Enzyme design. Structure first.
Site, PDB file in Angstrom:
ATOM      1  N   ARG A   1      39.832   3.535 -48.899  1.00  0.00           N
ATOM      2  CA  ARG A   1      40.260   4.422 -47.819  1.00  0.00           C
ATOM      3  C   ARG A   1      41.189   3.692 -46.855  1.00  0.00           C
ATOM      4  O   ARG A   1      41.679   4.288 -45.891  1.00  0.00           O
ATOM      5  CB  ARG A   1      39.074   4.917 -46.991  1.00  0.00           C
ATOM      6  CG  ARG A   1      37.914   5.487 -47.739  1.00  0.00           C
ATOM      7  CD  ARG A   1      36.771   4.542 -47.840  1.00  0.00           C
ATOM      8  NE  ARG A   1      36.575   4.065 -49.204  1.00  0.00           N
ATOM      9  CZ  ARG A   1      35.985   2.912 -49.501  1.00  0.00           C
ATOM     10  NH1 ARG A   1      35.548   2.125 -48.526  1.00  0.00           N
ATOM     11  NH2 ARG A   1      35.836   2.534 -50.763  1.00  0.00           N
TER      12      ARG A   1
ATOM     13  N   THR B   1      54.635  12.542 -48.882  1.00  0.00           N
ATOM     14  CA  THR B   1      54.741  13.901 -49.413  1.00  0.00           C
ATOM     15  C   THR B   1      54.374  14.866 -48.306  1.00  0.00           C
ATOM     16  O   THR B   1      53.583  15.777 -48.496  1.00  0.00           O
ATOM     17  CB  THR B   1      53.786  14.137 -50.592  1.00  0.00           C
ATOM     18  OG1 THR B   1      52.473  13.673 -50.246  1.00  0.00           O
ATOM     19  CG2 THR B   1      54.280  13.422 -51.831  1.00  0.00           C
TER      20      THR B   1
ATOM     21  N   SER C   1      58.703  19.016 -45.958  1.00  0.00           N
ATOM     22  CA  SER C   1      57.628  19.886 -46.417  1.00  0.00           C
ATOM     23  C   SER C   1      58.100  20.940 -47.407  1.00  0.00           C
ATOM     24  O   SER C   1      59.296  21.049 -47.695  1.00  0.00           O
ATOM     25  CB  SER C   1      56.968  20.573 -45.220  1.00  0.00           C
ATOM     26  OG  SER C   1      57.860  21.460 -44.555  1.00  0.00           O
ATOM     27  N   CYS C   2      57.152  21.723 -47.919  1.00  0.00           N
ATOM     28  CA  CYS C   2      57.454  22.780 -48.888  1.00  0.00           C
ATOM     29  C   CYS C   2      58.339  23.816 -48.230  1.00  0.00           C
ATOM     30  O   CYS C   2      59.356  24.212 -48.782  1.00  0.00           O
ATOM     31  CB  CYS C   2      56.168  23.440 -49.374  1.00  0.00           C
ATOM     32  SG  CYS C   2      54.804  22.252 -49.560  1.00  0.00           S
ATOM     33  N   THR C   3      57.940  24.244 -47.036  1.00  0.00           N
ATOM     34  CA  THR C   3      58.691  25.226 -46.267  1.00  0.00           C
ATOM     35  C   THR C   3      60.114  24.708 -46.002  1.00  0.00           C
ATOM     36  O   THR C   3      61.094  25.417 -46.261  1.00  0.00           O
ATOM     37  CB  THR C   3      57.998  25.486 -44.916  1.00  0.00           C
ATOM     38  OG1 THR C   3      56.715  26.073 -45.145  1.00  0.00           O
ATOM     39  CG2 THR C   3      58.832  26.403 -44.046  1.00  0.00           C
TER      40      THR C   3
ATOM     41  N   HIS D   1      53.080  31.913 -45.223  1.00  0.00           N
ATOM     42  CA  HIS D   1      52.609  31.092 -46.320  1.00  0.00           C
ATOM     43  C   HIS D   1      51.105  31.091 -46.501  1.00  0.00           C
ATOM     44  O   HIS D   1      50.341  31.369 -45.574  1.00  0.00           O
ATOM     45  CB  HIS D   1      53.149  29.658 -46.184  1.00  0.00           C
ATOM     46  CG  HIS D   1      52.803  28.984 -44.894  1.00  0.00           C
ATOM     47  ND1 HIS D   1      53.650  28.085 -44.280  1.00  0.00           N
ATOM     48  CD2 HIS D   1      51.686  29.031 -44.129  1.00  0.00           C
ATOM     49  CE1 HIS D   1      53.068  27.608 -43.193  1.00  0.00           C
ATOM     50  NE2 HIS D   1      51.874  28.165 -43.079  1.00  0.00           N
TER      51      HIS D   1
ATOM     52  N   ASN E   1      54.418  27.190 -53.332  1.00  0.00           N
ATOM     53  CA  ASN E   1      53.821  26.170 -52.484  1.00  0.00           C
ATOM     54  C   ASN E   1      54.042  24.727 -52.901  1.00  0.00           C
ATOM     55  O   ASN E   1      55.091  24.152 -52.606  1.00  0.00           O
ATOM     56  CB  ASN E   1      52.333  26.421 -52.315  1.00  0.00           C
ATOM     57  CG  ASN E   1      52.048  27.807 -51.847  1.00  0.00           C
ATOM     58  OD1 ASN E   1      52.913  28.450 -51.261  1.00  0.00           O
ATOM     59  ND2 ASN E   1      50.834  28.286 -52.096  1.00  0.00           N
TER      60      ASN E   1
END
Lengths: 322, 322, 322, 322
Positions: free
Chosen positions: C80, C122, C154-156, C182, C302
């Site tokens: 982590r 990402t 981002s995706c958007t 979305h 998405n």
């Protein structure tokens, strides 16, 4: 001989039937016409784009009165009255009836008068006079002359009958009950709706020995595709979970090969989309109380696996035309 | 005496518990503090606006460290470690543990070290050391000295145990099985997710005679609120559908009055929202095979009825503080 | 050279990244390790079964510490803390950071200290110091030495930037606004949730000329996959619907080929699942008021198309390693 | 005079209209009959149980031909042909047409021939011949003689027109565009379905100055109730976000009091259920680009607020019968 088929109704089932058929290694069928409620365009569009199965990859071309799909073309007609259909003119042998409106032998036989020799209902038959067959359960009983109007029962019945069959052959059902939780009078989008189901009694039709031994209830859920049956039966031969799953697996590799899918992998709804089996057992969910109270949960892809079974029955009916 | 209560965690259950408490005709409870993970504002906001129960109509006013609701105000604190809480300083008798993180006796008793005399878990207890009680099923067995840490079992168990109780009292369960289809590791929004359930075994705790006689399986659906249990039991005294529904109705008017709701009207999920009973029987769904295989379907409002039962147990624990 | 990649985080994005990469005709990438939060088994399972993309057909075999997929195997580790990672020992060149927890240049650079030479987020970069690139919009500006920590936005933003790009190059945006509807602080399963979005400002990063010229709002819906952007811009060169769609189509066949998908066919959400483009224009929905108020609606899958863009950027970064 | 009203169709809108009417502090309306497609039982059942509005708390008692709700009873009849109705015999003044099948002046006037003097369509009028009114926007233009058949436009138009009104009155719209994302030919349960909307043009009817100045697009989502409108307009008087929200709030406290609700609190869909206003502005979402490109997002409770407006118009039509 390669019989001539006409599909009456081009909705979920009709379309699914078409896709399943193309894609089949071989066939004694020859679809020649489709009776719609819309134009030859709407048909080609709906046949190509599926909000469920996804885009159908095959050469699709429409026309004013026809639709061609990978060479084979087929006449498109629009008649809300089977009595009006040119079934005789078009030498229609078998008619796939998937409008859900003609399910009584007399209603469905309107196609017979229109000149068709045999009609198969993609739904349960209402009343008597129809021949119900569930592939993998009672198809060995199929004889071409028994009924003009035959039925493939329902999706639920098709998921249930195979399982009941095996369980019964191996342990012997005494009495049982089932609850089918399946997808799409009140906003069913926000509720879980209790409804009746004939699938329980329907199984008696394809497994007479189980007459009066099963009963069920349905619960409708706002789920996309895949549904499930919850089967609780009290058997004769006491057994253990390991062994119940054992027979179901054997069947899935033999006698019920291609009919029953035996999944042991930890999966969910979506995972069974596009499955050709009409009944997928989820072994991880099998329970056995005091060695004789068995419970089996099986997943079934609503109309897809059902459609594979429908093509199977049309085919059987062909290989057996007299 | 009117015991002082502190609610640990202010989510679904905590908020529900508060509402159910206000609105109670009487109470031996005095809520004095709420431990959150956010501010006294977020608390009064979430207490007022419910995407499920709707807007809570009552004078709600926040503050930097407190929250007043219809006169009665209560200290707001934020400690992710029960050991750090001012339970001793605030003379906290009973702590409603609803964070789902402290369900083992030793974990939950951290509230004890912090100065609280008794803690009640709004969830199943993990391991041994806790006392599980299901109002209407074993609340007569309550004795203040038995457990410092007590549990109210779960929503499912609270829907199931009452039914099992009656069924067993009237026909005697030999063995059975249940499948709970309830609402909210994979996108559960698009699937039907199989998952384990301890409700089967839980019932053994509040009905010891049914020890090792029940087993269950859960199916998670993308439904909003209400859930349902599917109970199939093999009884001793053979009966008939009409009579199984007859005893369940008697119970809903007597022994299990307020606990079990007997609905015969044709309804759906939504219709049972805000129902105070923790188990609503849908009589139209009762089946009896060969006189001794009983199947009962009961609806339960996820966290609301459960919360009514939680206040009920806190209250019983008050009327019985030694 | 063929750079060595390590994927940090194996959720939607990490997994999608893996699938997209296999399947790529060619590659200058060589994935060698994946840092998870679970075991090498859970990884292989999640990598094979997708409740969205469906089952991943490729030879998948797990192991205690690795995972093999069509020959190529890769080390599985669970830390982590990026600071702890054996990035230096494993000669890790590029690290795909998809945990969403390290988005500031300093946080992400923990991978750099661990020995990695370059890390790609990402997700949008928080604060300054990172290099944002949107394939098809500003990838010609990519230079290996500019940033150690780069972002793919981002995706958007990836659905928006391409469109804004074209519209701007052809008509010149003066000012605009956008609303992104979305998919997946309140039960988002039953609500339509308003939320903020940086995609509007993010576009300025990859199209500086649009700095201070765009603004947006987000509305979250309980939809499965596919999302959409609603772009309203006021242009300089007055035009007509026919012509706006014309340029968008040209772009989809050239300059933005493979980035922007031009769909004229009447379709819906589902229809765009598995689309490799990061932005699908729905020409039928284009409107132009008084020749200078343009509105374009575009669909975007998405995380899938986003993932194709992520592999594209890792690749670009490889073909350009200095 | 207190006019006699007959409700044609008893679905979503009819039922909603009944509820909104009962509960009104006063009324010049006297509901006397309801034309259904089912029995007086199904009617009292659907009137009592709402999967949306919840259980209607009022004394409901059915009968073979009537339905009594809090004293006042009303004749139940079933005729799928308005021409056949006993409107003359029952002295029906105003008929609330809510079946969506008679929206053209000639269709709706079938109720006139059947003996009713005036009919109001709970939906957009088709063709010409009807009078559209949107309470709060052009209700001052109401004159009993203008139309025998009047329309209340639609839910969307009733959310949009008030806002446009204020915005235009205060800054002057030059041109604009809107996108309505509202709830319930393809499985809409799994998609986001683009569809047409006349609400844009509809507004021209109740605000003639905006003729040809607005245009819209609709997106259907699988949401339960509340919907939303996305309005982007280019104004004359340049302004600032703070000031656009300032006028909208003034309006909600004056000229558009009861019609427009001004919400500044951070909320979501569910929160606006049962809201009487037909248009709720979400101030936190207001954007203004370069001082003259305004964007307003407003929520509207599908059929409930619309129904409050329907009763409002019936009432206005009463207080104005000539």
């Amino acid at each position: 001989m390669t019989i001539r088929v006409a599909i009456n109704g081009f909705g979920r089932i009709g379309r699914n039937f078409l896709r399943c058929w193309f894609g089949r290694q071989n066939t004694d069928l020859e679809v020649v016409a489709i009776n719609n409620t819309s134009d030859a365009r709407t048909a080609a569009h709906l046949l190509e784009y599926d909000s469920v199965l996804g885009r159908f990859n095959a050469d699709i071309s429409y026309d004013e009165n026809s639709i061609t799909v990978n060479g084979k073309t087929m006449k498109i007609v629009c008649d809300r009255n089977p009595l009006n259909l040119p079934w005789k003119e078009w030498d229609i042998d078998l008619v796939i009836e998937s409008t859900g409106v003609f399910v009584t032998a007399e209603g469905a036989s309107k196609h017979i008068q229109a000149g068709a020799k045999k009609v198969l209902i993609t739904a349960p038959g209402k009343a008597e006079g129809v021949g119900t067959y569930v592939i993998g359960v009672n198809d060995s009983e199929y004889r071409h002359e028994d009924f003009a109007v035959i039925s493939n029962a329902s999706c639920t019945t098709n998921c249930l009958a195979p399982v009941a069959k095996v369980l019964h052959d191996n342990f012997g059902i005494i009495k049982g009950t089932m609850t089918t939780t399946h997808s799409y009078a009140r906003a069913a989008a926000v509720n879980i709706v209790p409804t009746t189901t004939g699938a329980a009694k329907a199984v008696a039709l394809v497994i007479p020995e189980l007459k009066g031994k099963l009963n069920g209830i349905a619960l409708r859920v706002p789920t996309p595709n895949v549904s499930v049956v919850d089967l609780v039966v009290q058997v004769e031969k006491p057994t253990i979970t390991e062994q119940v799953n054992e027979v179901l697996q054997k069947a899935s590799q033999t006698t019920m090969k291609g009919i029953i899918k035996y999944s042991d992998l930890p999966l969910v709804s979506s995972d069974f989309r596009g499955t050709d089996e009409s009944s997928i057992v989820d072994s991880s969910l099998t329970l056995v109380m005091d060695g004789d109270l068995v419970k089996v949960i099986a997943w079934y892809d609503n109309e897809w696996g059902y459609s594979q079974r429908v093509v199977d029955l049309a085919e059987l009916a062909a290989r057996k035309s007299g």
